[PDB]
Design a binder for this molecule. Structure first.
Ligand SMILES: CC(C)c1cc(C(=O)N2CC[C@@H](NC(=O)C3CC3)C2)[nH]n1
Ligand SMILES: [Mn+2]
Length: 295
């Protein structure tokens, strides 16, 4: 049985008037987006912030991820540059599918990803950078710090409300984190600390595939997760269990849990609503930035 893609989550293409600030816009789309857990926001075509990270000195040690670690029930983290990681990432994907990386359909990577997660005869290992502080490496967005030069054409993005460094983070301190992905690199089902909102921007690269569950089904997902989780992980606290909450979306959908999907492309935002469980994986070499915010 092949993977059945969940229905698509809402995609909003606001005009320049509606693109005023995220909090006011997110508040207006809330009646629909909170019923799907996640949503995608495409900025106007003329809104193109330049990549402001120091690519030359961007050196990181990615995490190692075995796709079928739960099904099977040694591996250690090589330092890459942003360019050397991309060469490895593209070589892996083109070799795996035996075709140019830009020719692999997104539905094929999705179908192959979920086959490998539950496959016991093929062990696929990938690498990714995650939770990289924008303070130590610089943000993908231009920032008024004096650390790097801001051109006059870039000041509008350093002051934009959609710049993740300008999101309100103080609940009635925190900085955005960076994520460098490759094909099959994934993140497990989780919600944010304090049931916070989260906003995610894909600066460049191949798409990031998301799955989302509305907050009204959070208890149902947790019950399905605990009923099907291994016996040794079923009783673990949520903060620790979320580190290994891998589950095919079709399994949740079979148990009545509503699940929505989307492919986040370069230059697009993804917002997850409070207590909306979400998971996903990367289609290929990409660079993302994320922050939890409060309304
Ligand atoms: C604000 C911080 C705490 C955060 C990050 C996320 C999240 O869910 N993200 C980030 C991008 C994507 N993760 C990946 O692509 C991983 C494989 C490399 C999903 N939520 N809050
Ligand atoms: Mn998240």
């Amino acid at each position: 049985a092949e993977f059945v893609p969940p229905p698509e989550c809402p995609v909003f293409e606001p005009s320049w008037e509606e693109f005023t600030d995220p909090l006011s816009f997110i508040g207006r789309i809330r009646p629909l987006a909170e019923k799907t857990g996640i949503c995608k926001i495409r900025p106007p075509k003329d809104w193109q912030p330049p990549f402001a990270c120091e690519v030359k000195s961007f050196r990181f040690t990615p995490r190692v991820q075995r796709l079928n670690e739960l099904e099977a029930m040694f591996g250690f983290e090589r330092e890459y540059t942003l360019q050397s990681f991309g060469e490895m990432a593209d070589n892996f994907k083109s070799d795996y599918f035996n075709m140019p990386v830009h020719m692999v359909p997104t539905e094929l990577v999705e179908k192959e990803f979920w086959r490998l997660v539950s496959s016991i005869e093929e062990d696929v290992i990938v690498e990714y950078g995650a939770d990289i502080s924008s303070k130590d490496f610089g943000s993908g967005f231009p920032v008024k710090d004096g650390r790097r030069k801001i051109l006059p054409e870039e000041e509008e993005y350093a002051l934009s409300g959609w710049n993740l460094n300008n999101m309100p983070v103080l609940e009635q301190m925190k900085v955005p984190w960076l994520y460098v992905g490759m094909c099959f690199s994934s993140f497990c089902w989780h919600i944010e600390d304090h049931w916070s909102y989260s906003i995610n921007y894909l600066h460049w690269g191949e798409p990031k595939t998301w799955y989302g569950v509305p907050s009204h089904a959070a208890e149902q997902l947790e019950e399905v997760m605990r009923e099907l989780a291994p016996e040794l992980f079923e009783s673990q606290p949520d903060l620790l269990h979320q580190l290994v909450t891998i589950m095919n979306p079709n399994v949740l959908m079979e148990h009545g849990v509503p699940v929505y999907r989307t492919n986040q492309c370069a230059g697009e935002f993804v917002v997850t609503f409070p207590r909306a469980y979400h998971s996903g994986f990367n289609q290929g070499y990409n660079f993302a930035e994320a922050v939890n915010f409060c309304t």
